[model samples]
Target: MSWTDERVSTLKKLWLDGLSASQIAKQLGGVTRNAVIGKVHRLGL
Candidate 1:
């Protein structure tokens, strides 16, 4: 399965809020910190 747009949007918000990758992962439910980091890195935000 792949990450959806909604999840990516949430990640952006969390990132802008200054949350760490691990923190974003926790908010996104099943994702790990690595998953969160990967998404943010791809989005460049």
Candidate 2:
């Protein structure tokens, strides 16, 4: 899945704010944690 700049920025902020991958996924309406993890890996988080 391709994440948009705005979404990625939001995800990055959430990550920096101490949200776990699973937590972020849940906040994103229960999107897969693997998707979040993949994005984090792609973005070098």
Candidate 3:
């Protein structure tokens, strides 16, 4: 699953919208909750 620019933007927007990692993961598809959290961390969010 590639993290396209649009997907990354959506992740940031959802995170800023107060969505949980699990919820974001579900919304993003092709990703797990842990994966979402890890990427968020790596992104320095």
RMSD of each: 1.3, 1.9, 0.7
* Candidate 1 lDDT, 1-45, residue by residue in tens: 358888877888889999999987887789899988888888977
For residue 17, give model 3's deviation from the true position in Å: 0.9
Global Cα lDDT for candidate 3: 0.93
- Candidate 1 worst ten-residue window by lDDT: 1-10
* Tens digit per residue, CA lDDT, model 3, 1-45: 768999999999999899999999999899999999998998999
Q: Give the winner by lDDT.
A: 3
Candidate 3 error regions (>4 Å): none
Error of 2 at 37 (Å): 0.6
TM-score of each candidate?
0.85, 0.78, 0.91
Which candidate do you rate higher for lDDT, 2 or 3?
Answer: 3
